[PDB]
Amino acid sequence: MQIFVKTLTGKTITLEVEPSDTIENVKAKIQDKEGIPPDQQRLIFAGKQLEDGRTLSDYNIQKESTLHLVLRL
Amino acid sequence: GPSIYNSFYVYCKGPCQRVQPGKLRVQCSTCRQATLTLTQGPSCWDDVLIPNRMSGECQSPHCPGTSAEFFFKCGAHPTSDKETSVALHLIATNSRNITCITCTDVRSPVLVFQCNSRHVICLDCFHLYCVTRLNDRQFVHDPQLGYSLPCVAGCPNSLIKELHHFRILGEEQYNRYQQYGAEECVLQMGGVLCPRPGCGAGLLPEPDCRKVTCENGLGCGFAFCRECKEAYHEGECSVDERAAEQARWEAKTTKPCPRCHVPVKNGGCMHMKCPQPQCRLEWCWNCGCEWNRVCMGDHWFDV
Ligand SMILES: [Zn+2]
Ligand SMILES: [Zn+2]
Ligand SMILES: [Zn+2]
Ligand SMILES: [Zn+2]
Ligand SMILES: [Zn+2]
Ligand SMILES: [Zn+2]
Ligand SMILES: [Zn+2]
Ligand SMILES: [Zn+2]
């Protein structure tokens, strides 16, 4: 499936994922595209900071749903 | 035939883009095939939500499968095997005929809160409840759950766990809720958003640091005070109580079988089996017919 990672800037990145993908994998996928290290990445959905050892299915994140990215400095 | 009563509601993203009745489906959690023969059919929602909670035996020889996986699909269009909708599990058909706590009318379907009194609100009122609260930034932020709301009546321990219930906001308001939740998450984390207009980019600076530079090149990029939100300076900064009673989800016993006509209910599980040996029929408590596929899909269990 495909999800959208939106920064609060409005900046939207398109990612190809699967429900089995862990947040850890998702962050690595973001690093592969944008180049932001996962260590600086904090992904939020439904207003919860998503944990690395949970999958998109765990968070019930649906096809073409939208994640939020916040940076740690 | 099987009655067109349904107990399960989902949110269809395409093309219904609204909340529709849902179909319940099941599989061996191991082979992802339709081969799991359930020991006992589901009776509560917990059975169809908590994973590996329902047990059985996968009929494939290759599987060692012993657990059932429950998925939900739309109940309004031809659904591909891949098209799973998120099941909103607080929504139920108002068979009991109860009253929206906000609007004091019998409506259906309704959303039953997990508050201690199992309060009922209709979806329309729930909508207004979420719309006012969301924009008034009066949504709760539990860092362990996310952005949510409790019982309208303010009951304790009632915060909505499945945050997909907030699709009742509608696409514009839901998308906002997604933003508002992320915004509030950063702030309450002690993080800051960009003060510059057209940026708003969330930042989580070093716990003790007044100098925040909004910075791949994806930053503001602008430096500011973590306090007064100016360019970093070395200088100094600058519900009706009655309607709540009549809106409780708990405020049929036994029926004879269509054959042995001997009286028989297993929790909310609508799958009934005639106990008499010359009978031994599988029948639906609601539909009234012989246990079938549609009955399974529409209302395997009831609330
Ligand atoms: Zn639909
Ligand atoms: Zn199997
Ligand atoms: Zn209402
Ligand atoms: Zn309540
Ligand atoms: Zn910025
Ligand atoms: Zn200052
Ligand atoms: Zn019988
Ligand atoms: Zn039935």
Side-chain angles (χ1 to χ4, degrees), chain A, chain B residues 1-16 18-39 41-106 108-115 117-214 216-231 233 235-251 253-272 274-303:
Chain A
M1 57 187 198
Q2 219 182 39
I3 57 158
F4 309 104
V5 180
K6 207 208 89 191
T7 87
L8 284 160
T9 332
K11 172 89 226 79
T12 301
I13 309 134
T14 330
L15 262 185
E16 267 284 321
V17 291
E18 286 279 298
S20 69
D21 277 321
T22 66
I23 294 299
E24 194 165 68
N25 301 151
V26 180
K27 282 178 180 179
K29 282 179 156 56
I30 292 169
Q31 193 197 19
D32 280 329
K33 205 178 181 201
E34 296 307 308
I36 314 158
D39 335 296
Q40 285 193 324
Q41 287 184 49
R42 256 13 145 270
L43 280 167
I44 301 167
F45 180 90
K48 193 213 165 188
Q49 190 192 125
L50 309 169
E51 256 58 71
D52 285 323
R54 284 266 142 277
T55 71
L56 291 161
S57 93
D58 303 326
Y59 287 131
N60 269 306
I61 286 154
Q62 282 271 109
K63 184 209 78 171
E64 277 180 56
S65 288
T66 174
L67 258 61
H68 273 66
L69 176 63
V70 172
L71 285 214
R72 180 221 56 91
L73 319 156
Chain B
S3 177
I4 42 85
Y5 172 76
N6 27 38
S7 306
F8 317 135
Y9 298 101
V10 297
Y11 182 105
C12 204
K13 301 230 301 185
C16 310
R18 76 169 59 232
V19 169
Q20 296 288 25
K23 277 279 209 166
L24 177 57
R25 304 288 190 236
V26 60
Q27 46 186 16
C28 178
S29 56
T30 329
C31 60
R32 234 93 168 272
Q33 273 180 330
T35 31
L36 209 292
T37 297
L38 273 154
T39 43
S43 45
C44 58
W45 274 100
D46 282 357
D47 293 10
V48 299
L49 293 169
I50 302 174
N52 299 336
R53 167 134 161 174
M54 287 274 86
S55 276
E57 197 200 325
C58 195
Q59 300 303 76
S60 256
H62 38 85
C63 202
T66 179
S67 294
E69 182 181 13
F70 287 106
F71 61 108
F72 287 82
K73 312 168 87 67
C74 257
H77 30 122
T79 345
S80 308
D81 331 293
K82 29 146 267 77
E83 282 159 27
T84 43
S85 322
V86 160
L88 311 171
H89 78 270
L90 297 156
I91 313 177
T93 314
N94 204 350
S95 53
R96 287 164 150 86
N97 293 315
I98 329 283
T99 60
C100 179
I101 189 178
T102 311
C103 71
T104 313
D105 288 315
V106 173
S108 180
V110 288
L111 179 137
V112 177
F113 277 101
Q114 277 314 303
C115 77
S117 299
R118 286 190 77 181
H119 269 107
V120 32
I121 195 175
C122 96
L123 308 186
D124 301 301
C125 286
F126 183 78
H127 175 70
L128 298 163
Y129 169 61
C130 290
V131 166
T132 56
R133 289 274 164 264
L134 170 65
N135 291 97
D136 270 352
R137 301 276 194 164
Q138 267 150 52
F139 256 64
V140 189
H141 178 259
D142 172 34
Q144 304 199 347
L145 180 67
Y147 218 40
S148 191
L149 283 179
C151 196
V152 183
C155 289
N157 300 341
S158 58
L159 256 93
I160 287 168
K161 256 79 197 184
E162 175 51 295
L163 299 187
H164 274 110
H165 280 86
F166 296 132
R167 275 207 142 286
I168 296 169
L169 277 177
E171 217 217 46
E172 245 219 330
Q173 282 269 278
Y174 169 80
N175 271 317
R176 164 157 316 168
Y177 154 84
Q178 289 273 72
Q179 197 184 249
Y180 269 23
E183 283 181 347
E184 220 78 31
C185 186
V186 184
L187 289 179
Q188 302 203 20
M189 260 189 76
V192 291
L193 319 167
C194 212
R196 251 221 51 87
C199 220
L203 308 149
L204 306 167
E206 293 312 300
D208 277 357
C209 191
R210 290 107 219 109
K211 180 265 207 300
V212 188
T213 318
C214 177
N216 192 245
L218 75 146
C220 233
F222 157 86
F224 64 100
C225 198
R226 206 232 211 104
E227 325 276 314
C228 70
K229 253 60 84 176
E230 301 308 311
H233 28 250
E236 271 87 40
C237 272
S238 61
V239 188
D240 182 47
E241 191 205 303
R242 193 284 269 147
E245 264 116 50
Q246 311 293 123
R248 291 174 293 169
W249 190 252
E250 265 93 42
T253 50
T254 55
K255 283 203 269 72
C257 159
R259 208 208 156 267
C260 47
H261 275 102
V262 162
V264 189
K265 197 196 172 190
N266 252 146
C269 191
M270 310 232 83
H271 174 259
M272 312 296 301
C274 190
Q276 251 45 67
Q278 181 70 264
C279 188
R280 285 176 79 252
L281 191 64
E282 293 180 342
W283 56 280
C284 165
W285 183 270
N286 177 263
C287 293
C289 59
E290 199 201 349
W291 195 249
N292 72 108
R293 39 230 61 97
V294 183
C295 270
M296 266 161 53
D298 283 19
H299 52 278
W300 208 319
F301 67 100
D302 207 357
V303 255

